[PDB]
Amino acid sequence: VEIDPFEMAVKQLERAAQYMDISEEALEWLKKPMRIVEVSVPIEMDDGSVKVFTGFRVQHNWARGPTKGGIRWHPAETLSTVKALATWMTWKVAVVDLPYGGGKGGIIVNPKELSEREQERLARAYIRAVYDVIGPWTDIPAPDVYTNPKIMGWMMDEYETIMRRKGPAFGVITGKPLSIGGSLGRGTATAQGAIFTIREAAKALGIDLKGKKIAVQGYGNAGYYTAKLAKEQLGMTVVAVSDSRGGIYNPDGLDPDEVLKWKREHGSVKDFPGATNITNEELLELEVDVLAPAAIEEVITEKNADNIKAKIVAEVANGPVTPEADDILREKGILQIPDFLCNAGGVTVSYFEWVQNINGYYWTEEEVREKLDKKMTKAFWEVYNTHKDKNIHMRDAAYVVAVSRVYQAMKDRGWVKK
Numbered sequence: 127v128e129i130d131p132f133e134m135a136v137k138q139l140e141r142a143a144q145y146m147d148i149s150e151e152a153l154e155w156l157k158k159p160m161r162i163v164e165v166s167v168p169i170e171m172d173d174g175s176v177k178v179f180t181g182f183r184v185q186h187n188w189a190r191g192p193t194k195g196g197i198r199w200h201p202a203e204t205l206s207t208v209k210a211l212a213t214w215m216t217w218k219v220a221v222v223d224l225p226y227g228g229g230k231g232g233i234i235v236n237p238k239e240l241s242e243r244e245q246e247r248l249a250r251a252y253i254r255a256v257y258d259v260i261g262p263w264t265d266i267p268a269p270d271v272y273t274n275p276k277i278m279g280w281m282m283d284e285y286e287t288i289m290r291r292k293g294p295a296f297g298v299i300t301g302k303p304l305s306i307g308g309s310l311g312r313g314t315a316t317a318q319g320a321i322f323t324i325r326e327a328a329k330a331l332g333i334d335l336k337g338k339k340i341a342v343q344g345y346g347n348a349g350y351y352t353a354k355l356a357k358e359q360l361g362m363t364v365v366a367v368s369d370s371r372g373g374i375y376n377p378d379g380l381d382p383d384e385v386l387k388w389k390r391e392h393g394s395v396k397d398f399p400g401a402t403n404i405t406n407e408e409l410l411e412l413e414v415d416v417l418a419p420a421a422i423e424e425v426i427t428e429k430n431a432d433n434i435k436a437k438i439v440a441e442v443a444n445g446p447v448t449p450e451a452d453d454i455l456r457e458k459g460i461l462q463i464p465d466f467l468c469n470a471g472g473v474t475v476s477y478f479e480w481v482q483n484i485n486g487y488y489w490t491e492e493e494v495r496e497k498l499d500k501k502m503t504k505a506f507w508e509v510y511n512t513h514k515d516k517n518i519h520m521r522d523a524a525y526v527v528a529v530s531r532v533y534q535a536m537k538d539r540g541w542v543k544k
């Protein structure tokens with residue numbers, strides 16, 4: 127009825143665990159976050175009043191290392207959502223082999239109605255409230271929905287003020303501006319990882335992407351950068367893009383820069399010059415070789431699963447495919463890249479930023495790109511090898527890999543004896 131996010135995450139975990147040999151005690155440990163912190167966030171309003179907000183900080187598991195995750199400023203943010211996202215972040219950092227755990231934060235607030243001063247006060251108060259459970263080697267927050275690098279800089283400054291500069295205060299939080307412990311390649315991290323996964327999938331399927339067609343659903347940051355990087359690096363033809371308002375179809379190809387400029391000038395991609403106007407419900411079924419949903423979740427359902435014609439479906443967004451759609455697409459011979467494997471580039475570049483901050487030495491764009499390429503290629507090939515050995519779904523193989531790594535880390539620490 128309500129389909130609670132945490133229940134769905136636990137159900138997914140059980141489905142995954144049924145495909146591998148894991149002890150009952152370890153599964154019960156994994157079903158519950160290891161630490162949940164709920165705090166009040168009082169700030170001073172611009173009119174002089176004091177408003178109290180509810181903040182969350184869930185650390186699902188830290189067997190493999192310090193927990194990692196973003197902070198969401200959404201009016202419809204709940205504890206369940208934070209717990210489910212921390213659980214998913216655990217597997218996200220485990221599949222791509224990072225020395226990280228799972229974490230997530232969130233404040234129930236509408237940031238659209240907050241001023242800059244009030245936003246800074248909210249960030250500083252959240253840091254003051256959750257200081258006792260965060261740190262460079264304990265919990266590293268990150269940008270997420272309705273949060274940008276400016277809030278990251280404010281949060282890092284507040285943490286440094288509280289910590290009295292007794293250590294690497296830069297590394298307590300990632301996604302910061304380049305002037306203060308920032309990292310090169312952060313803006314295009316997720317799309318770069320998605321492009322690397324798409325290239326590896328094409329390599330696995332034996333099809334060259336040069337001259338091929340790609341359709342991207344959702345033209346936000348991730349969708350725009352995915353289309354642009356595909357067109358440049360992969361040599362593919364961006365045939366169709368879309369947003370919430372509508373979509374664009376052009377067999378001859380779309381220039382991502384031109385489409386982004388049009389969207390910026392008119393607020394939407396609708397009615398692009400010299401292009402056919404469509405919507406998402408027929409965009410998802412266009413004849414393409416790579417489809418990259420980079421928008422609101424749950425766009426592929428059993429209704430439209432049988433009509434998908436893409437050879438590769440790169441789940442850039444967070445869970446855009448339902449399990450029934452997963453089964454239907456696997457039956458059709460379509461190679462799916464799991465959601466928490468395709469967009470693992472953002473957390474990988476976040477890890478690179480944390481390493482740079484901890485070490486005090488900062489890398490270049492080429493070094494970050496090469497390291498990200500190596501990490502994403504290795505993770506995808508491990509997942510595909512499991513998918514080829516166990517004769518299971520790609521999402522199932524990614525779950526097996528991540529849960530196996532976490533379980534091995536737990537067994538090594540002695541947390542679970544079986």
Ligand SMILES: N[C@@H](CCC(=O)O)C(=O)O
Nearest residue numbers: 348420421442443444472
């Ligand atoms: N928010 C992104 C995916 C999640 C992420 O960026 O980490 C989208 O829905 O397009």
